């Protein structure tokens with residue numbers, strides 16, 4: 001049986017109000033599946049996180065629009081089993097296990113109250129969960145995997161903002177929503193080693209596509225995201241960090257080090273908010289004080305802990321910013337991947353990673369004991385054409 005995903009959810013499965021539920025994104029309800037503590041999956045196209053982006057009608061170099069995708073319960077059960085299977089694959093790694101744990105730990109901070117002495121949740125770091133008796137109760141979560149909006153292949157990580165606070169960047173953190181599909185993959189290129197096998201089309205293992213957005217999710221959960229302002233003469237610092245590898249030192253070790261001490265200080269600001277705290281709204285004040293100490297790897301002192309172990313911050317901060325990277329995950333999955341984010345994808349492939357004969361948790365497309373095992377022939381869209389239907393812009 002499983003390990004990350006508690007049970008095997010079918011979309012047919014009956015609402016129970018706890019892990020199978022109709023919810024409201026903080027509008028009409030959607031069935032949602034709590035695959036793991038703090039992590040839900042919504043197998044719908046995302047019409048909800050954007051008040052403007054409330055449609056799927058076509059209006060970016062590579063794009064793909066189909067208003068009907070993720071419409072049938074047959075699609076939604078598959079979408080769910082895909083994300084599930086992709087969750088298991090990423091968790092099957094020492095890297096993916098550690099990052100999912102940082103993500104489950106990374107509970108968004110209680111910086112909600114105008115009141116300086118008071119801890120309160122921020123409304124947006126919740127969903128409203130309709131309990132079978134036909135009533136709604138707010139539940140905190142860290143992560144939502146949701147299906148895409150109009151552009152099917154527009155994968156991202158977003159979060160409800162604060163009227164004053166930069167939640168993903170002040171250390172607080174915020175509930176994270178990933179528009180993601182295990183139902184599509186993009187083509188990239190590399191001509192192997194056999195010096196040159198011309199211009200072939202390999203497919204991205206969508207476990208990498210998912211890993212990418214989780215690393216963003218982890219960044220934004222620990223409120224250590226880099227301002228999307230910060231770019232390369234034009235590519236996001238946050239993306240270059242997230243991709244990692246040869247790209248990673250395009251970001252100067254100058255801003256690398258100011259970014260680090262800026263977050264150290266926003267951690268200390270957070271450790272003072274707790275100590276100064278004398279009240280709580282809605283769990284125990286101390287229980288909730290100890291979840292954030294667990295989160296920010298806080299210390300011990302009988303007067304009232306307070307201290308940030310600058311040595312322990314360093315190990316968390318780097319784990320999140322410099323080890324949790326797309327490149328490192330590529331070495332673990334042992335797949336053919338982009339050698340840079342500065343790439344672009346060329347083609348869009350319809351895939352089905354659900355049937356174990358198509359894709360596994362341990363090898364993805366590149367199945368053991370087959371031709372797909374050699375030379376990443378699993379990911380090669382010319383050889384494994386039976387697992388990739390090319391589509392256009």
Ligand SMILES: [Zn+2]
Nearest residue numbers: 212216239242
């Ligand atoms: Zn990204």
